[PDB]
Amino acid sequence: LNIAVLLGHSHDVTERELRNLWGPEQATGLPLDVNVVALLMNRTDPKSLITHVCDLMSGARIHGLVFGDDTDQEAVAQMLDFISSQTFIPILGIHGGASMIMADKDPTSTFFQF
């Protein structure tokens, strides 16, 4: 369904190329909705992160999040896990601080890491 892919300046790839991943992403469309909303993120302030996540949540009701970061800040990972508990949004850490492994997550959080 409605899934958000949120990247920073990693490789400076625009959101259009992220939106291009609709055919290969479940070509045999089971929910016939699989719409991908791609946003660009300039800085990793926790206030900005929370605002972006929950505003995009209020916008078109995203059912997931694929978060990638270009900074070596592990705290971002934590700032996602906490959010996963407050929003019940499955979040997937891709690159940077988000992909840094986390020891213990609260059970009510659906955050997963690569």
Partner: protein, 100 residues
């Protein structure tokens, strides 16, 4: 008053507990921009009368490595520096009771 003749001043700012953890983190971050604080304290278990988790404050001030000094929470989730980067507390956690 009782810290010598040095002419440095200590100023105190405070924010109110809110039921929303998201609003708690947002208020703490706004507070940050609003005071250039040096440390943050969290000591209210019963005022929200809930899980009372100071986790939003700990995460927000550990993003900038600003030390947090909790005074009431005794859970062991705050005793590992990998998860909570800049957390300290004046009350030992429940896991210390084992020693007794």
């Amino acid at each position: 008053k009782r810290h010598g003749s040095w002419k440095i001043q200590l100023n105190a700012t405070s924010v109110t507990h809110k039921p929303n953890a998201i609003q708690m983190a947002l208020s703490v971050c706004e507070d940050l921009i609003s005071s250039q604080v040096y440390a943050i304290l969290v000591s209210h278990p019963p005022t929200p009368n809930d899980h009372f988790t100071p986790t939003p404050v700990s995460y927000t001030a550990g993003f900038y490595r600003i030390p947090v000094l909790g005074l009431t929470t005794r859970m062991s989730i705050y005793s590992d520096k990998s998860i909570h980067l800049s957390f300290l507390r004046t009350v030992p956690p429940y896991s210390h009771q084992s020693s007794v």
